[PDB]
Amino acid sequence: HHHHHLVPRGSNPPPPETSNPNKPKRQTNQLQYLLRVVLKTLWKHQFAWPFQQPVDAVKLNLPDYYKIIKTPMDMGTIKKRLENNYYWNAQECIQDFNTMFTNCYIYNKPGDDIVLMAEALEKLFLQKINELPT
Numbered sequence: 576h577h578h579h580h581l582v583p584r585g586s587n588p589p590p591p592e593t594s595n596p597n598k599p600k601r602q603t604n605q606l607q608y609l610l611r612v613v614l615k616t617l618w619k620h621q622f623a624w625p626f627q628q629p630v631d632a633v634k635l636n637l638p639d640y641y642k643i644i645k646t647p648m649d650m651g652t653i654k655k656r657l658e659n660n661y662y663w664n665a666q667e668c669i670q671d672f673n674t675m676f677t678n679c680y681i682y683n684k685p686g687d688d689i690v691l692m693a694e695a696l697e698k699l700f701l702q703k704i705n706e707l708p709t
């Protein structure tokens with residue numbers, strides 16, 4: 576038979592939402608710090624680039640990525656969520672960072688370049704978290 580299954584093709588899933596009008600939201604001092612200090616310091620770091628947007632499994636040739644990672648998260652999404660006042664509290668935002676880092680550790684192996692990057696970003700994150708306003 577002449578159907579060789581060359582189509583349909585793969586794709587990336589839809590990215591995480593950055594807007595949800597019926598979601599409860601608040602501005603808090605802790606969230607303002609998470610944007611101004613935590614996100615902005617990580618964003619400019621030389622290790623930020625793999626984490627500045629959703630994993631593009633097509634471009635990066637990671638066809639297994641979304642078979643393994645079912646709760647994707649990235650700093651581009653977190654930045655948009657902070658700019659859009661999406662969060663109710665600091666915990667919701669911190670959980671997004673934790674998810675991002677954990678996804679990287681799940682998908683990859685200790686000592687991989689991308690894991691070294693995530694570990695360094697996570698160390699910085701945890702340092703900035705320890706100065707969160709009370």
Ligand SMILES: COc1cc2onc(C)c2cc1NS(=O)(=O)c1cc(Cl)ccc1OC
Pocket residue numbers: 625626630635637679682683688689692
């Ligand atoms: C192995 O390639 C990757 C693994 C990943 O886990 N999480 C992300 C995001 C991620 C991205 C890639 N691909 S990559 O081109 O960004 C890449 C980054 C680094 Cl620091 C090292 C290798 C590499 O691709 C081979």
